[PDB]
Amino acid sequence: QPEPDMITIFIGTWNMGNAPPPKKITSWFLSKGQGKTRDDSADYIPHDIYVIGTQEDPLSEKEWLEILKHSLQEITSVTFKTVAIHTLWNIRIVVLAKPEHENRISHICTDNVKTGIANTLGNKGAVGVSFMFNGTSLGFVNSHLTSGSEKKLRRNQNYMNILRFLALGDKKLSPFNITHRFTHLFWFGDLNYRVDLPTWEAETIIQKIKQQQYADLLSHDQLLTERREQKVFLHFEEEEITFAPTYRFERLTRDKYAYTKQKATGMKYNLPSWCDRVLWKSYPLVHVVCQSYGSTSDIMTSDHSPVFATFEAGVTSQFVSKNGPGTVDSQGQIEFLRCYATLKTKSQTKFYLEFHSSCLESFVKSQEGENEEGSEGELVVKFGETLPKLKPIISDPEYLLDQHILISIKSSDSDESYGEGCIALRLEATETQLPIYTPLTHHGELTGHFQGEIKLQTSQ
Numbered sequence: 135q136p137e138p139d140m141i142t143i144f145i146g147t148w149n150m151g152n153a154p155p156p157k158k159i160t161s162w163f164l165s166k167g168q169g170k171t172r173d174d175s176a177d178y179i180p181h182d183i184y185v186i187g188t189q190e191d192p193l194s195e196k197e198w199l200e201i202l203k204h205s206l207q208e209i210t211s212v213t214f215k216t217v218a219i220h221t222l223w224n225i226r227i228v229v230l231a232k233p234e235h236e237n238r239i240s241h242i243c244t245d246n247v248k249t250g251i252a253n254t255l256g257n258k259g260a261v262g263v264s265f266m267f268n269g270t271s272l273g274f275v276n277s278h279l280t281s282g283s284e285k286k287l288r289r290n291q292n293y294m295n296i297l298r299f300l301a302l303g304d305k306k307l308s309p310f311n312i313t314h315r316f317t318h319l320f321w322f323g324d325l326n327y328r329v330d331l332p333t334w335e336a337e338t339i340i341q342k343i344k345q346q347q348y349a350d351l352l353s354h355d356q357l358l359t360e361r362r363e364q365k366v367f368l369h370f371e372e373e374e375i376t377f378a379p380t381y382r383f384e385r386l387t388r389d390k391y392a393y394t395k396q397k398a399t400g401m402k403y404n405l406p407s408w409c410d411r412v413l414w415k416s417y418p419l420v421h422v423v424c425q426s427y428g429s430t431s432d433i434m435t436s437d438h439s440p441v442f443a444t445f446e447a448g449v450t451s452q453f454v455s456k457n458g459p460g461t462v463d464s465q466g467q468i469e470f471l472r473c474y475a476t477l478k479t480k481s482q483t484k485f486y487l488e489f490h491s492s493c494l495e496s497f498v499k500s501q502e503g504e505n506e507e508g509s510e511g512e513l514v515v516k517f518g519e520t521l522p523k524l525k526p527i528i529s530d531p532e533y534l535l536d537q538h539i540l541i542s543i544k545s546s547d548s549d550e551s552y553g554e555g556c557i558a559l560r561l562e563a564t565e566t567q568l569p570i571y572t573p574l575t576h577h578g579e580l581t582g583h584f585q586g587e588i589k590l591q592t593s594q
């Protein structure tokens with residue numbers, strides 16, 4: 135029975151509004167309703183992994199697991215295995231997989247982050263799950279960010295706290311936050327970003343939604359605008375939104391948006407908004423294709439509609455050779471030529487690099503680089519031809535060309551990372567000098583760039 139080189143992943147996010155779900159929620163797992171929907175001809179084909187994020191979830195873990203498993207069994211005639219479930223307050227993540235994957239899944243991690251301080255600490259935050267699927271690392275984050283149209287900056291702060299403090303994936307990757315630890319990272323939830331238009335335009339907005347004319351609304355969506363200005367979710371992707379705003383509905387219909395200020399809303403307007411989102415970030419040159427992104431039309435217990443997204447995602451096998459794992463394969467090497475980091479820092483310490491990769495027995499520290507002044511104020515750290523030759527565990531090009539090198543640039547004075555990035559080994563050529571490049575981030579904000587050349591030797 136061969137190992138897969140692709141899987142499909144279902145991501146669901148639903149703010150349940152503290153209400154039990156209706157008896158049938160299968161449309162959610164089938165990607166049926168509005169937006170980019172799944173073809174009917176696929177309805178019986180199970181996804182490999184289903185990741186369900188809820189917010190304002192009033193159910194016990196047991197109650198929700200029973201509904202989810204019975205839903206999937208009805209659709210697919212497959213009894214899914216529970217990979218992980220984790221709850222913070224009323225924020226929950228469930229991971230289910232086909233039974234055939236049980237012995238492909240390992241290193242399961244769960245964590246949560248509570249956002250805010252005092253007043254603002256007690257119901258918002260995130261839960262997450264990570265695991266290995268054969269040779270591929272997968273991370274999943276369900277966040278419920280701060281509400282309210284005038285709190286986009288708070289949401290952005292909530293995002294940075296979650297990606298700094300959520301402890302998922304390989305703890306040996308110590309310089310790297312969750313935005314660098316996984317082959318594929320999916321981040322979803324009630325992100326709570328709003329359509330920033332004047333209150334007086336509420337009925338105009340509703341009109342536009344009835345005509346399925348979303349362009350002049352999406353141009354004011356705070357998540358799209360904040361992302362464009364590099365304030366949040368830097369280097370993440372989102373599929374085009376082609377479904378109506380998923381908030382705020384009158385319960386038990388979808389015919390009405392309930393936007394007017396009420397005591398129950400803290401006297402805040404809730405203009406129709408795309409609160410409920412799925413984003414992702416995958417390592418460079420790894421296959422990831424969104425095959426659905428939409429909302430259900432027939433699940434009406436909440437003031438939010440469920441959102442679905444599905445993905446084709448490239449995966450690799452758990453590779454064994456005669457040599458690695460357990461030794462190096464002298465027929466393999468990774469060399470770096472003419473490399474330099476450009477950093478936004480005003481500081482003047484020496485810097486060194488760390489190279490981390492599951493193709494190495496352990497991480498590699500470089501010598502200190504040579505600091506120069508850039509012509510526009512910048513710090514340029516030159517490594518020239520000084521970087522160590524990296525010794526992969528396996529030389530087979532079928533393995534090595536699918537790997538990635540994480541790079542941290544660290545202060546000699548403090549050993550703190552000033553920037554993290556990732557280089558793909560999916561090169562156009564081996565035994566050939568080729569340009570490489572990554573942006574560098576720290577706490578998910580841009581801090582610089584790393585560029586140079588690579589020369590990869592495989593056994594072929």
Ligand SMILES: CC(=O)c1cccc(NC(=O)N2CCOCC2)c1
Nearest residue numbers: 352358361362363372373374375376
């Ligand atoms: C740089 C930047 O972030 C940017 C800039 C312009 C447009 C978009 N569009 C999206 O992000 N979309 C399309 C609509 O539905 C969600 C995803 C993004």
